[PDB]
Amino acid sequence: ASVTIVKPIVYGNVARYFGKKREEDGHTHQWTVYVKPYRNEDMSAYVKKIQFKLHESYGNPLRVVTKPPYEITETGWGEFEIIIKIFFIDPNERPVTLYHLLKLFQKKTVVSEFYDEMIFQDPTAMMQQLLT
Length: 132
Fold this sequence. Notes:
By secondary structure, this protein is mostly beta strands.
């Protein structure tokens, strides 16, 4: 590519352990799954929406966030892969797909966070402007 623009991100989840297993639904944790820029920037300048695909056991498993912060807070008992799909304002830009294993146990606070880079190769002039 003649122009390469790299936007570093971090993604993953935090989990907060209840005293013990909740009687009503057996949930043990509140958790937040998220994507955020690696350093201070407003991704919403160039991100259209971020989808979070949860386990089939959630009644509403496809969650969508269009305004920062790009995060979903839920309760649960299970650890499973969440698919994070980042769509851009430029329809010419392929979405970014991330995969994250939700982590609840290592203990009152658990953080599972990873680094990645969204790489834009020869974007349109309009997307290059939004990115820079």
